[model samples]
Target: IVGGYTCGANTVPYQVSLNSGYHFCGGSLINSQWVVSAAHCYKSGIQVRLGEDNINVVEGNEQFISASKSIVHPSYNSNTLNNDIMLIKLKSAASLNSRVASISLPTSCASAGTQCLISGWGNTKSSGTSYPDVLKCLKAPILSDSSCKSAYPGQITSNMFCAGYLEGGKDSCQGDSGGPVVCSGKLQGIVSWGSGCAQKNKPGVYTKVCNYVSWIKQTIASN
Candidate 1:
């Protein structure tokens, strides 16, 4: 994320490294076996690493698990990039501890301009190719669905929303894709898409997690 700081232990334990073989996309561990990420993140050799803040070093508390299955939303709009959410079932459960944890799903909508936080090991600068080994986080301000509608134009749907600054400078960048957008201590959205990283008037777009609560329950129960 842009304008972020490298966080410490127990800061954002729900965060996961969505390794697609080539690079690490961001993800959230909602439970022991289930990880939520953007559907577009699904690729060859998808695996998850939990607990550790840095990807380079194995901090001992890390819980490494390969994905057993990937369930992309049936109605995912690949072209429009709407409903860009996915669930990854781990081959085994993650061990819970101070350095590893899950976040609760939201049951209600986050009002316009809610104070929020997003975390990841994305590009520190928009033009950077390599992501830092340390995890990073930044504060975000949720834009009204009305304002977001104006920003993305015909792209914002009931299943999507935006967060960040209109003036730009602060936002989730490329490698921050599929990261968690936590608000009021609950997961309200998943990092889905955006225009140029940290560009003005083009805040980060996310999958409204509250809209998929029912679908999440049904998917996990059946699988």
Candidate 2:
């Protein structure tokens, strides 16, 4: 959260820690063997840690799972940030438990003005170096495409959505990418990018997940 509020442990079981030797981003467990995240979060040392609430601690409920494969959306564009989603296939399937579970993919797109929640262990301050070890969450309302376009100009594509306060208090920061944007208890978006962390009139941008549900299924099936 740009406005930090620590989330309770086990509250968001699907929330996972994405580590590349270091905790780089957050991800959501979509299945026993698959993880969904942002392509921008990709790095060489990628590993998934399920059921981890604190990035600094090794809880009994956590599992440091290795990845056998990483699939970034083939059409992902770094400059425009289009199709910025990615999937990671676990080398070994995970076991289900109360602390570790999967989230449901959205069956449809999100409507504007809908309140959504994002959770991550991103930096607490825009200019600060330290990141919180515990998870943080915040509520943000979705903005219409037109409204979002006003802020982003020609950059707001259909594959993305905007959410955050216009005044810029609660938003995702530099280290929060690939985190979950859960709307009405369903996975709807993935934290993508923004101009700067929590700036005025600049809402946090997210990769709209609904549009890729079919793609995700097909990829999982065909892989």
Candidate 3:
């Protein structure tokens, strides 16, 4: 099943060794032509792999593609973390395999209260530590716009989405940024930020995937 995929400690699907050995949280194969991930996940020596569960034990085949180009949102400001999004264009297209399949991007916003899946190789417990394995995933319900706005006050924007429990203790953490928040069998959000792991009165914030459909289509088409 595609639900609840996990990775072993320190094992990630791609290699981003140049910066500080930080692993990317999630990846989506956009057809055979491209792989989609968050801009912050960008690193110099990154390698991508598909169709593997355990990064340590599984001898999975990997596709080493040079990141030909990276385009982070022009308005992105690390201070407030506004427009914290980007796209990676591979030097070449990847071949289709059983372990690898492309995920679809949402063309429109989901109705309020939609449930989605969030996944990454992040810390399982808040304030505990990063997972030493490949990756892990969980499910959460999408919040209504009014509820999300109420929770974050002025932080919620049209370009964002929200998920997680209000009481706390389960969420996407530092390494989980730039991952996927999937819903309705399509990609709906990119993991953005959350209120210190999982905490009450705070939910995980994500980049609204539907908001960038045109940009994504254009970017893919141009490349």
lDDT (C-alpha, whole model) for all candidates? 0.87, 0.89, 0.66
What tens digits encode model 1's per-residue C-alpha lDDT throughout 49-133? 8886778877778777899999989988799888899999999999888688899999898988798999988887866665788
TM-score winner among the candidates?
Answer: 2
lDDT by residue for model 2 (110-170), tens = 8999998899988777656668888899888898888799999999888999998888777
Give candidate 2's TM-score. Answer: 0.97
Give lDDT: candidate 2, residue 32. 98
Clash-forming residue pairs, model 1: none
lDDT score for residue 8 of model 1:
78
How does residue 185 of candidate 2 score in lDDT?
80
State candidate 1's TM-score: 0.96
In what order do the candidates fall by TM-score, top score first? 2, 1, 3
For candidate 3, the TM-score is: 0.84
